[PDB]
Design a protein around this ligand. Structure first.
Ligand code: HEM
Ligand SMILES: C[C@@H]1[C@@H](O)[C@@H](C)C[C@H](C)C(=O)[C@H](C)[C@@H](O)[C@@H](C)[C@@H](C)OC(=O)[C@H](C)[C@H]1O
Ligand code: NA
Length: 396
């Protein structure tokens, strides 16, 4: 083919491909072939182009549901998915559940959440050093939180985790495998909301079931798909992001010691580490211009698709000083770790709360925390659209 394959390469730990910094400098918007659908997409590497592709009404995610649209993942996007709804229906779909995810209702969770983190750190001191931080904190903590929030039975963790890993496949699985799991996840979630039909609950699944009986603008598929989106995102992001921030802290240990030194640096350290880490391994859900749109170096034509690399916008030397350097004393940090525009993460305040409480708790109660397995053998998850560790053995 004429144009290059994206992703450019199999990923390495949390390392940014050095082609991203080259593209930022000399070819900020470049033709790429995505691993699925047909044709070519524009890859967007710098912050101001990213803010436009994510920000502007001229770009449609709905339009990207066409099976022939380029995408990073094997199944054509599900049309009832939030990510694939354009405003204003997108705005109506997000109000179903938005109430619960406002910064103010998330601040109210801090105590419940800080207890939870204390129990799990109790059970780790009980087991004794070494222990797998994945096993004792990363997985059970966030899984417990969205289970309480959604009203999903904690006893289903092995069930929904397996569905959730399959639906975040890049290469590990095939279209037919994933499409199968989508159907199961749909039918499962449809069943959990169904149980609320006679017995409404003080729950987001509760709210989703209420919405199914009375709403006239949203399909049952949209409302139920909402519950799967929140159950996947609500654990998959935080589970990976706790291993990623711990990996960044302990592999140049000065950082971890800087937070043990001052545990009030932890909210700023979280934002800085959200900026620094390619949690999304490559690309994004795709946006198709509905009209000509001007970017820094090119006019994207109506019908041309675009894809963003969040981690590369977060390294743009024209908005962050010493961008390739980890710094907890940055005066300003306008990162897009949580996206931008209508699809800006609903969970951003929750993911902040969960990461703050996990790191505060560690950095206060375990000053002696060190990686007790070698860097070279670290089990980075492979062939998923997200990055994170399968395990993280730590001593103290
Ligand atoms: C550290 C945690 C998190 C990170 C880094 C993260 C990152 C992101 C990013 C970058 C997007 C935008 C994708 C795009 O527009 O193409 C996004 C969207 C989303 N995130 Fe998060 N997220 C996190 C936590 C959460 C949590 C805790 C939830 C749910 C409880 C969640 C649910 C979502 C949902 C549903 C979307 C799609 C929203 C929409 O289409 O309107 N995320 N997230
Ligand atoms: C399964 C996810 C979906 O649950 C979303 C809402 C969860 C997370 C928080 C996201 O929204 C996430 C940032 C995705 O947009 C990307 C990982 C993208 C490459 O993957 C996706 O586009 C995939 C296929 C989505 O459907
Ligand atoms: Na897409």
């Amino acid at each position: 083919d004429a144009v290059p394959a994206y992703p450019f390469s199999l990923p390495h730990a949390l390392d940014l491909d050095p082609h991203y910094a080259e593209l930022r400098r000399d070819e900020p918007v470049s033709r790429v072939r995505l691993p699925y659908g047909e044709g070519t997409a524009w890859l967007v590497t710098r912050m101001s182009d990213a803010r436009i592709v994510l920000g502007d009404s001229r770009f449609s995610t709905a339009a990207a549901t066409d099976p022939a649209t380029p995408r990073m993942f094997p199944t054509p996007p599900e049309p009832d998915g939030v990510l694939a709804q354009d405003p204003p229906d997108h705005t109506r779909l997000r109000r179903l559940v938005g109430k619960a995810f406002t910064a103010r209702r998330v601040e109210e969770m801090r105590p419940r959440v800080r207890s939870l983190v204390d129990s799990l750190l109790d059970d780790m001191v009980a087991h004794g050093s070494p222990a797998d931080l994945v096993e004792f904190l990363a997985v059970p903590f966030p899984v417990a939180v969205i289970c309480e929030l959604l009203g999903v039975p904690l006893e289903d963790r092995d069930l929904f985790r397996t569905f959730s890993d399959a639906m975040l496949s890049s290469t590990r699985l095939t279209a037919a495998e994933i499409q199968r799991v989508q159907q199961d996840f749909m039918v499962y979630m449809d069943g959990l909301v169904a149980q609320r039909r006679d017995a409404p609950t003080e729950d987001l699944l509760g709210a989703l079931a209420l919405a199914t009986d009375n709403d006239d603008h949203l399909t049952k598929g949209e409302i139920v798909n909402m519950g799967v989106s929140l159950l996947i995102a609500g654990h998959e992001t935080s589970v990976n992001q706790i291993t990623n921030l711990v990996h960044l802290l302990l592999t140049e240990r000065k950082r971890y010691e800087s937070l043990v030194a001052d545990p009030a640096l932890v909210p700023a350290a979280v934002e800085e580490m959200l900026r620094y880490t390619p949690l999304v391994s490559a690309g994004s859900f795709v946006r198709v211009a509905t009209e000509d749109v001007e970017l820094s170096t090119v006019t994207v034509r109506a019908g041309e698709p675009c894809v963003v690399h969040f981690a590369s916008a977060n390294r743009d030397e024209e908005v962050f000083d010493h961008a390739d350097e980890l710094d907890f004393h940055r005066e300003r940090n306008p990162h897009i770790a949580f996206g931008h525009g209508a699809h800006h993460c609903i969970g951003a305040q929750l993911g902040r709360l969960e990461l703050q409480e996990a790191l505060s708790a560690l950095v206060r109660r375990f000053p002696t925390l060190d990686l007790a397995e070698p860097v070279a053998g670290l089990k980075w998850k492979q062939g998923m659209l997200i990055r994170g560790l399968e395990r993280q053995i730590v001593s103290w």
